[PDB]
Design a protein around this ligand. Structure first.
Ligand SMILES: Cc1ccc(NC(=O)c2ccc(CN3CCN(C)CC3)cc2)cc1Nc1nccc(-c2cccnc2)n1
Length: 261
């Protein structure tokens, strides 16, 4: 049978990390040596084949900025096993104890890594549909990987996708722009004070988030390209990656540290 299959005895579940109507998530050990994240399926909540769809996808994806599948147990009770990311979610990391020490340089490097991951998704002709800080994992050495915890996130979703169900890599680019604001505000909810309804009215009317405090205008400019009304006007993740990797030399060479960024 499949080469991803592992014996049940090789997986230890050590710390519960969350729950849902379809299962749970745990940190644990695989082969008594490898720390892992584990996703379970509640028997009786959702069909196995519908659940293992995710694992099937994850077998065909391989990239250093994508959370990596490690193994599965594909007879109920089901287990999906991936690499473990020591710092947890980008969102939690941004707003917690570490967040006070991150400046533009680390934050833009995180963005470039995320764009790199998304650029692979771009080349592979996949769509993400839920790119946001909550679906980014952080590891040692500020390593950031794209994940999908299957967690409507209107505030992160391109208008044409939210309104008309048109989800492309270009609506992923819009989400990335919103992700840029999470990075520069240390994980704050976008469109502060506005509910979903006003967000949709306002954005359709052409409103866009302002340059966050201490964020270089040139980075907010980039956010605004990600938020172009016309999907095809938005940049590629290939471009986004290259722009963020070169940012402090090509775009903002006179950058000087500040109080928060
Ligand atoms: C245990 C597991 C099982 C499945 C997944 N799957 C994904 O992360 C994922 C990523 C991309 C795709 C591709 N897909 C293309 C099509 N569109 C519509 C959706 C995305 C699918 C699944 C992750 C995990 N990992 C996981 N889950 C929850 C929490 C954590 C975690 C928490 C703290 C520290 N380290 C890890 N780790």
């Amino acid at each position: 049978k499949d080469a991803w299959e592992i014996p049940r005895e090789s997986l230890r579940l050590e710390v519960k990390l969350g729950q849902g109507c379809f299962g749970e998530v745990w940190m644990g050990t695989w082969n008594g040596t490898t720390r892992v994240a584990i996703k379970t399926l509640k028997p009786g909540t959702m069909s196995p084949e519908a659940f293992l769809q995710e694992a099937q996808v994850m077998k065909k994806i391989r990239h250093e900025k994508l959370v990596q599948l490690y193994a599965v147990v594909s007879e109920e009770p089901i287990y999906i096993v991936t690499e473990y990311m020591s710092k947890g979610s980008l969102l939690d990391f941004l707003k917690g104890e570490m967040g006070k020490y991150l400046r533009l340089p680390q934050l833009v490097d995180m963005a470039a890594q995320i764009a790199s991951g998304m650029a692979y998704v771009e080349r592979m002709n996949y769509v993400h549909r839920d790119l946001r800080a909550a679906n980014i994992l952080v590891g040692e050495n500020l390593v950031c990987k794209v994940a999908d915890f299957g967690l409507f996130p209107i505030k992160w979703t391109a208008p044409e996708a939210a309104l008309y169900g048109r989800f492309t890599i270009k609506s992923d680019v819009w989400s990335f722009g919103i992700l840029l604001t999470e990075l520069t505000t240390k994980g704050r909810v976008p469109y502060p004070g506005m509910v979903n309804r006003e967000v949709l009215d306002q954005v359709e009317r052409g409103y866009r988030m302002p340059c966050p405090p201490e964020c270089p205008e040139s980075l907010h400019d980039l956010m605004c390209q990600c938020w172009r009304k016309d999907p095809e006007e938005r940049p590629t993740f290939e471009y986004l990656q290259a722009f963020l990797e070169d940012y402090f030399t090509s775009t903002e060479p006179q950058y000087q540290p500040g109080e928060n960024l």
